[PDB]
Amino acid sequence: MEQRITLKDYAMRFGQTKTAKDLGVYQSAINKAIHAGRKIFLTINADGSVYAEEVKDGEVKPFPSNKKTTA
C-alpha cells in the first residue's frame, strides 16, 4: 500500500546517503541495518515523507523510535 518500499531495495533505487538522511540517522547505522540482513519497509507519503516500518519476527518498530518515559 502507498510507497511502502523496503529499507534495502529503496536505498538501491535512490542511494545509501539519501535513505540515511531520510530517516535522520548516521550513515554507518544504515549500512549495518541494511548490509546486515534485516527486513524493514518504509511507507513514503509519495510527497517525500518517510514512515520506517521494521518487522523483526517478534516486534515491529519505526526506528528511530521514541519513548519519553523511563528516560
UniProtKB/Swiss-Prot annotation:
The keyword Protein biosynthesis appears for this protein: no
One Pfam entry name: Cro
Keywords recorded for this protein, A-Z: DNA-binding, Early protein, Latency-replication decision, Repressor, Transcription, Transcription regulation, Viral latency, Viral latency initiation and maintenance
Recorded superkingdom: Viruses
MF terms (GO), sorted A to Z: core promoter sequence-specific DNA binding; DNA binding; protein homodimerization activity
Residue spans binding DNA: 16-35
Gene3D superfamilies registered for this protein in UniProt: CRO Repressor
GO biological process, one term: negative regulation of transcription by competitive promoter binding
Function statement: Plays an essential role in the switch from lysogenic to lytic state and in fine-tuning the lytic phase activation. Mediates the de-repression of the lytic promoters from repression by cI at an early stage of prophage induction. Turns down the expression of the transcriptional activator cII, a factor that initiates the expression of repressor cI, the major component promoting latency. Additionally, cro is able to directly bind to the promoter region of cI thereby preventing the transcription of cI repressor.
Assembly and oligomerization: Binds DNA as a homodimer.
Name of the protein described by the UniProt record: Regulatory protein cro
